[PDB]
From a paper:
Inhibition of the protein-protein interaction between [name] and [name]β represents an attractive alternative strategy due to the crucial role of [name] and its selective involvement in the canonical NF-κB pathway. Here we report the structure of the unliganded N-terminal domain of [name], utilizing the coiled-coil stabilized [name] construct modified by four additional point mutations, designed to improve solution behavior and crystal packing. The crystal structure reveals that [name] folds in an irregular dimeric coiled coil in the absence of [name]β, with discontinuities in the heptad repeats causing an underwinding of the supercoil in the ligand binding region.
The SeMet labeled [name] mutant was prepared to facilitate the phasing of the EEAA structure, but displayed weak anomalous signal, and the structures were instead solved by molecular replacement. The longer side chain of Met65 extends deep in the interhelical cleft and the structure accommodates it by increasing the interhelical spacing by 1.4 Å and rotating the second Met65′ away from the center of the bun. This increased spacing seems to trigger the opening of the bun in the following heptads, till the end of the stutter “heptad”. The open region encompasses ligand binding pockets I and II. After residue 82, and approximately at the start of pocket III, the [name] structure closes back to resemble the apo structure, confirming the role of [name]β in maintaining an open pocket III. The conformation of pocket III is instead almost identical in the [name] mutant and [name]-EEAA structure, both in interhelical spacing and in side chain conformations, with an RMSD = 0.372 Å over all backbone atoms within residues 89–104.
Residue numbers in the entry:
A (entry chain A): 20 to 142
B (entry chain B): 19 to 141
Write the structure that this text describes.
Amino acid sequence: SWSVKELEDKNEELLSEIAHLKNEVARLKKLLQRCLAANQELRDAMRQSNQILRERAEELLHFQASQREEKEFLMSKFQEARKLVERLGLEKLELEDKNEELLSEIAHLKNEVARLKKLVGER
Amino acid sequence: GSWSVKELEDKNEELLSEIAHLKNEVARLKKLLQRCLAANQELRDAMRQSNQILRERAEELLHFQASQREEKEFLMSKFQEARKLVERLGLEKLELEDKNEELLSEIAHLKNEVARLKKLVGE
């Protein structure tokens, strides 16, 4: 059907077609190798994000427990002091009432002393 | 005119089988590159969500600690004022107790003087 020259021209055509397809394979392998390397950089950085996020969540749980331990201890110191103010103030009022009753006894004893001394400047 | 018609036809079949192999490689490498590009997009879309969540939580922690620091300032500043109030009331209570002991000694002396003055007038 086909001559020698026609088969040679088709051979020349197929060889140029093999050369083009081989440049595509080499181009697609360079692309795939960069994309696989880019996927490795994204996976190493995403691993670090989850790893820092886990580290910061575990140190925050122990920090909140320490803040609770410090907040309880300062609070109990404020309550012990406030109660001490209420007790010192009431004991101060009970001492001031007792002192004013004593002054009334002294004022009565002083009047009694003067009354008896006018009696002795007569006898 | 080196090669015959039958030799050129067998070579033609040979070049075609190489094109069929290269065409399966190109289609295979395009599926790999397309899957890898899609995987990188899923990693970059998730990386951006993590960074946006990580950015919100760092801003909610920055403002939360500022209130914790201000509640620690306010519960502490109340405890300092109470301690000052305890030390002041303690001095006022000690001088009221000294006055109470001063008054009781005065009463006992005035009563002895009253009895002595009553014995002079015979009351």
